[PDB]
């Protein structure tokens, strides 16, 4: 009778629930917060307090960015179609991972690879252009070296105050000085910031070996950060459409080009 | 060492043996007997070998519900998800999850509501007035763009087939009388495709001979009818996904000028 | 001409210099140390809530974060991850199990207990009447926790509410119901759905940011189920990552656990 | 400029149109479900035998029992009291890689070998040398003298009705080599459907090679499996409701908990 399931993160078979070896009462006695629970359940580690707080700040900063982005819009459409909360949320979450919400992960990987390989920022920039590859985590539809992004400033201020070192973030900022020298909209965007700061946390907070940090980036920890954070906003938009008593939506024919054979 | 009772029960398909079985029909007999997709649905959903005209009706329903353009909630969401770079299954399901009481999934409720009124003995006008006195939408009635001035050819095709092939259509007849009343008052309160398929399946299940009344009522109650639209329209949503990938449409973001922001 | 807008929105404005959550700029959200609980108060309830309320919301997300791999949603997420799928697919395969039976009884519990309380029915008459009809008490019952196997999640929440909330009439009523139901069936405890449900009603009704009608509306539109959905999303993502790190392979349910009864 | 563009269906007129054919003409021409799929997925009026082939694939893939990942997940949702769409979707979301992905995988692998100009014996050897299993080959029980009847049925139709089947021919030569090594290593139903579908696209007359390859690459065969198996998943949903099955919780005896200390 060899067990068909295997699990590492939570044991609810005893009288008191356990998260990664910490009884739930100790989680609260130690004031771990949501960020510390995430460290237990996603990484099976008791993270330092500043790392737990940084995780919570990432969830707060990614909670929403308005009703116009793909996933919020799809949730809103479901809500207006009279659907339940979970269906509507899911409809929006399913838009995430590539062009919407995927740049956190892509930036963490692309910057880590350049940094680890020893290529300097100017040569990384020149390489990616000669190769016609966009630098993930760089560029924004509206923000600029003159209209800075406040979410970037907030997270940047915090990690510099608490992290032992932020080498990948510093490298990414050297890239930004070069890219914005040319095009002022090629800033380090909020997705690139979270991505590189999260690598710096995993690599420098002391709870991970390099191999462990590399594995958690590879299996999608950062995808999870964006998904969990933005779920709060999408549920908010679901509730908002119901509070505003919004009826069924159908897209107007004027905004659609039909090109049949 | 002791025998553990099985935790799951299943009735529709057996893959354990020398050949696949659908509701007791071996797959070789399914094809020998020319059961087609409609007959396989009869086996897997209704546990019966249905008459040929019923199998053909099921296929007609899947064909007429296959798509209704990119503007409807589910197609719009599938398109947005494809344009966000997502895979076929994620994009399809993002659209399917819009299907419900307002878009696409009123077949269950329409069958139940019309059956109740019909079986209760109230006449069509009394049904319309009662729903109005309560605060209740007539499910299977109404459309955002189709109307008495813009008729739905899907409904016509289905009606035509049912009248030629079904042995009895009392609920469809009742529903058309209702539609006569609702469209006099408001021109887009037509019998929509959900309502037509809903009442036509009630007529089929009650009168085709393969079901007892108890069985027919149970299939309405557990939600079989909505599956017809879900399975049908899945072909269109997959089409939209493929279309958007071929067209290489980029990431969508809704325009701010179409949104009224009213924060506290 | 002025074409009217087709969408309305009230919770977040990203158009300006600085992101705004429900009228609070993101800089002030962090200066005021609102935390995740305060952001939820802003985005879901459109209010700046007191700190003890924000901390209670965070506690609810922490205590609902996971309850093992055996429950319906974690099971489905694990199986989807073992099928090689991506994080979002695997998470949502499990979230879609949340409803009346597993995880999503908070809406119904809050509505049913609020209705009983507001009507003046005493706990025993509430129990007998649901018993005399065929209606489950939402927020009562558990497959494995019981009077002999208590839920520490419930204990932690009750302790916090008792220390910080200004009033707890619905919780007190629900605990009276639990005494009655567990007298005859040891598994009919007040579960985490019912506890969070009734505690949230007590919070919304008495925190001072809502009229009774406004609080009742949030129950009616289904806000409280979101608390479990968002909370448990953290555990389901954890299960996905766990299965990927464990290199667990494709799952297929054993035939010996399935009774086939075809026509 | 219009924000949406679409090619497959026009519902703006009085009469609905599928890819240039009015719906009344779809029925007058007895296009069937296969012909509708040709219009909506490919914007082509496919030959009759191609349309019938498509319907046979949907029938053959409709279900394969309650134990596979997606059917199981749908069953769990149904036992949790959820609605049809939620329960169906929970199961569909398991599809694409280790479950339900072999039609696509086999189409691609065989097409790549064939287009390499490499002969079957060299393909088998290249794959052994690269450590790769051959997609669409192998079955747990059936054998060169105990055949899979789904393969027999579809193979017979294809060989009787397709004018040319070069990729199937190629795959049958691979199978003769692999069944010499192990009588178990048959072309399975996913391999058959995969290569036959490629043959249909490449040889039915309606597509250029570029178009055929594009439809494979963007997931047309994933679509065939999803649409086909959706019929069975809906069946399982209804079955669980009919059988009045209550909430499931997996037994602790079948679970190995390995938390940190
Ligand atoms: C973001 C954008 C599409 C913008 O493009 P743009 O449209 O302005 O410019 P393009 O027309 O593509 O090109 C202009 C010229 O600059 C060159 N150029 C552009 N980007 C370049 C680059 N990265 N590396 C090198 N060169 C570049 C290009 O090659 C051309 O050069 P050339 O013609 O040769 O002169 C683009 O940067 C991009 O893909 N970034 C990488 C992916 C990424 O990080 N995504 C996340 C962005 S944060 C986000 O998504 C969150 C959100 O925004 C969500 C919301 O609210 O919606 C929020 O706030 O939450
Ligand atoms: C479908 C729609 C939202 C349309 O409404 P409309 O928006 O135009 O009207 P509203 O502005 O909402 O209401 C104006 C006044 O009429 C009243 N009124 C409306 N419907 C009424 C009714 N049924 N019974 C009584 N009264 C009614 C209402 O109470 C209000 O009265 P009041 O406030 O008191 O002054 C609405 O009928 C509805 O929910 N139907 C029931 C659900 C149903 O059967 N859905 C399936 C149809 S689609 C489908 O399945 C697929 C599709 O065909 C879709 C596509 O192609 O688009 C495809 O193939 O994709
Ligand atoms: C939860 C369960 C299905 C368990 O039932 P059981 O299966 O053990 O009992 P059954 O065999 O169904 O019934 C035996 C006899 O008791 C009667 N009886 C049962 N419940 C009764 C009741 N509420 N009111 C009156 N009577 C009742 C029934 O009428 C029958 O009477 P009779 O046949 O006439 O002799 C059931 O209570 C139930 O639906 N509750 C309401 C929904 C609810 O609140 N769900 C949330 C709880 S989980 C959650 O949200 C998260 C979770 O904690 C999950 C985890 O950890 O697992 C986590 O964190 O993951």
> What one-character-per-residue DSSP string does chain C give?
--PPPSEEE-SEE-SSSS-EETTEEHHHHHHTT-HHHHHHHHHHHSS---HHHHHHHHHHHHHTS---SSSHHHHHHHHHHHTT--HHHHHHHHHTT-BTTTB--HHHHHHHHHHHHHHT--HHHHHHHHHHTT---TTB--SS-BTTB--HHHHHHHHHHHHH-S--HHHHHHHHHHHHHHHH-TT--B-HHHHHHHHHHHHHHHSSSS-HHHHHHHHHTTHHHHHHHHHHHHHHHHHHHHHHHTT-------GGGEEE---
Q: How far apart are alpha carbons B243 and A249 in whole angstroms?
A: 22
Task: Write out the E strands in chain D.
Answer: 4-6, 9-10, 17-18, 21-22, 255-257
Which two tokens mark B57?
């009706």
CA D246 / ligand 3 centre spacing (Å): 10
Residue D100 zone, left/alpha/beta (φ > 0; ψ -120 to 50; rest): left
Looking up tokens 């700029």 gives: C25
Contacts of A73 in chain D (CB under 8 A): none
Q: How far apart are CA D118 and CA B118, in angstroms?
A: 68
In angstroms, the CA C58 to CA C36 distance is: 7
Cα(D100)–Cα(D26) distance, integer angstroms: 31
| Cα–Cα distance, A45 to A39 (Å, whole number) | 6
Name B253's bridge partners.
A69
Residue from C143, A237, B81 nearest D89 by CA:
B81
What is the chain A residue with the closest CA to D250?
Answer: A5
Provide the β-strand partners of residue C258: B8
Q: Which residues line ligand 1 (CB under 6 A)?
A: A 65, 69, 103, 134-141, 183, 185-186, 189-192; B 253
C-beta atoms of D260 and A90 within 8 A = no
Strand D4-6, strand D17-18: pairing = unpaired
> What length does chain A have?
261
Q: What is the C-alpha separation between A57 and A50, in angstroms, rounded?
A: 10
Write down how long chain C is. 263
Q: Are B172 and B159 in contact (CB under 8 A)?
A: yes
CA nearest C48: which of C23, C30, C26? C23
Q: Is B142 left (phi over 0), alpha (psi -120 to 50) or beta?
A: left
To one decimal, the resolution in angstroms is 1.8
Q: How many other CB atoms are there within 10 angstroms of residue C61's CB atom?
A: 23
Could you tell me if residue A82 is left (phi over 0), alpha (psi between -120 and 50 degrees) or otherwise beta? left
CA gap A259, D32 in Å, rounded: 24
Helix C152-164 crosses helix C51-63 at what angle (to 10 degrees)? Answer: 180
* Beta carbons of A6 and C82 less than 8 angstroms apart: no
Rounded distance between C-alpha atoms, residue A231 and residue A3, angstroms: 33
Residue with tokens 């932020």: A166
Element spanning B231, H or E: helix B224-247
C232 within 8 A of C104, measured Cβ to Cβ? no
Report which ligand 2 atom has the smallest distance to the Cα of B195. Answer: 44
With an 8 Å Cβ cutoff, the interface of chain C facing chain D consists of 68-72, 75-76, 79-80, 82-85, 89-90, 92-94, 96-102, 143-144, 249-255, 258
Rg (CA), chain D: 21
Breaks in chain C (C–N beyond 2.5 Å) sit after none
User: What residues of B are in the A interface, CB distance below 8 Å?
Assistant: 69-73, 76-77, 80-81, 83-86, 90-91, 93-95, 97-103, 144-145, 250-256, 259
3-state secondary structure of B141: strand
Encoded tokens for D221: 């065969």
CA dihedral D61, D62, D63, D64 (to 10 degrees): -10
Residue A40: closest C-alpha in chain C: C238
- Distance (Å, whole) CA D25 – CA C77: 45
Give the dihedral sign, CA B182/B187/B188/B193. positive
Q: How far apart are CA B159 and CA B191, in angstroms?
A: 11
* Helix, strand, coil share (%) of chain A residues, nearest 5: 60, 5, 35
* Whole-number Å distance between alpha carbons of D101 and D123: 21
CA B98, CA B78: separation in Å to the nearest integer? 10
Please report, for residues B102, B192, B197, the alpha-carbon distance to residue B110 in angstroms, rounded to integers and kept in the order given.
12, 10, 9
Burial (0-12, 13-18, 19+ Cβ within 10 Å), D141: exposed
CB C241 within 8 Å of CB A221: yes
Reduce the DSSP state of residue A247 to 3 states and report it. Answer: coil
List of chains touching D (3+ CB pairs within 8 A): A, B, C
Q: How many CB atoms lie within 10 A of CB B260?
A: 14
Rounded to whole angstroms, the Cα distance separating A250 from D22 reads 23
8-state DSSP, A257:
E
- Cα separation, A151 vs A66, in Å, equals 14
Q: Are B138 and B131 a contacting pair, CB within 8 Å?
A: yes
Interface of A with D (CB under 8 A): 1, 3-11, 13, 18, 20-21, 44, 86-87, 90, 251, 253-261
- With a CB cutoff of 8 Å and minimum separation 6, the contacts of C120 are none
Q: How far is CA D54 from the centre of its chain?
A: 10
DSSP A45: S
Contacts of B103 in chain A (CB under 8 A): 81-82, 248
| Tokens describing residue D233 | 């998943």
Q: Is A31 left (phi over 0), alpha (psi -120 to 50) or beta?
A: left
Angle at alpha carbon of residue A40, lines to A36 and A41, rounded to 5°: 115
Rounded CA separation C228/A201 (Å): 28
Looking up tokens 């609980």, which residue turns up?
C37
The closest alpha carbon to C91, from C108, C66, C109, C116, belongs to: C66
Burial class of residue D172 (count of CB atoms within 10 Å of its CB; 0-12, 13-18, 19+) = middle
Partners for C (CB, 8 Å, 3+ pairs)?
A, B, D
Structure determination technique employed: X-ray
- Kindly provide the b/e burial profile for residues A124-163, where b requires at least 16 CB atoms within 10 angstroms of the residue's own CB: bbeebeeeeeebbbbbbeebeeeeebbbbebbbebbeebb
| Residue D144, burial from CB neighbour count under 10 angstroms (0-12, 13-18, 19+) | middle
Are B146 and B190 spatial neighbours (Cβ–Cβ below 8 Å)? yes
Residue given tokens 């977040």 in the structure block: C12
Tokens 């969408």 map to which residue? C7
Closest CA to C78 of C228, C230, C237, C256: C237
How far apart are the C-alpha atoms of A227 and A237, rounded to whole Å?
15
| Residues 6 or more apart whose Cβ sits within 8 Å of residue A185 | A139, A140, A142, A143, A144
The 3-state DSSP class for residue B10 equals strand
Rounded-to-integer distance, Cα C110 and Cα C138, Å: 8
Structure tokens at D59: 């029938």
Return all residues near B252 (Cβ < 8 A) that are at least 6 apart.
A70, A73, B79, B80, B83, B84, D3
**Distance in angstroms (rounded) separating the CA atoms of residues C261 and C256:** 13
Radius of gyration of chain C (CA): 21
Which two structure tokens, joined as six digits, stand for A74?
């799809």
Residues from chain C that touch D249, judged by Cβ atoms under 8 A, are 70-72, 143-144
Say if CB D137 and CB D185 are below 8 A apart: yes
Pairing of strands B259-261, C7-9: parallel
How many other C-beta atoms lie within 10 A of the C-beta of residue C70?
21
Does the C-beta of B68 come closer than 6 Å to ligand 2? yes
Q: Which of B11, B259, B263 sits opposite C7 (nearest CB)?
A: B259
For A51, the token pair is 């790392």
Structure tokens at D40: 């909506």
- Cα four-point dihedral sign C40, C44, C50, C55: negative
Exposure string of B156-177, with b = 16+ CB inside 10 Å and e = fewer, is ebbbebbeebbeebebbebbbe
Q: Max Cα separation, chain D?
A: 71
Q: Tokens in use for D115? A: 């287009």
Length of chain B: 264
How many other CB atoms are found less than 10 A from the CB of residue C209?
17
DSSP state of D254: G
Determine the straight-line distance between the first and last CA of chain C, rounded to whole angstroms: 65
How many other CB atoms sit within 10 Å of the CB of residue A118? 7
> First-to-last CA distance in chain A?
60
């Amino acid at each position: 009778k060899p067990a068909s399931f295997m699990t590492s993160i939570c044991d609810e078979r005893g009288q008191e629930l356990i998260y990664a070896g910490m009884p739930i009462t100790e989680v609260f006695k130690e004031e771990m917060g949501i960020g510390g629970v995430l460290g237990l359940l996603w990484f099976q580690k008791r993270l330092p307090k500043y790392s737990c707080q940084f995780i919570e700040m990432c969830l707060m900063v990614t909670a929403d960015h308005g009703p116009a982005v793909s996933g919020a819009h799809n949730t809103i459409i479901c809500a207006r179609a009279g659907k339940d909360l979970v269906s509507s949320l899911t409809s929006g979450l399913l838009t995430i991972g590539d062009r919407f919400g995927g740049a956190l992960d892509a930036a963490a990987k692309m910057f880590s690879k350049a940094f680890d390989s020893g290529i300097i920022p100017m040569e990384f920039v020149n390489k990616m252009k000669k190769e016609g590859k966009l630098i993930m985590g760089i560029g924004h539809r509206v923000k600029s070296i003159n209209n800075p992004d406040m979410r970037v400033q907030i997270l940047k201020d915090y990690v510099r105050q608490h992290f032992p070192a932020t080498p990948l973030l510093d490298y990414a900022l050297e890239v930004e000085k070069i890219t914005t020298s040319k095009k002022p909209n090629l800033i380090l965007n909020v997705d690139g910031l979270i991505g590189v700061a999260f690598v710096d946390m995993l690599r420098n907070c002391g709870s991970f070996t390099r191999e462990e940090a590399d594995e958690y980036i590879d299996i999608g920890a950062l995808n999870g950060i964006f998904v969990l954070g933005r779920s709060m906003g999408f549920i908010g938009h679901y509730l908002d459409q119901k509070r505003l008593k919004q009826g069924l939506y159908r897209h107007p024919w004027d905004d659609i080009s039909y090109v049949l054979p």
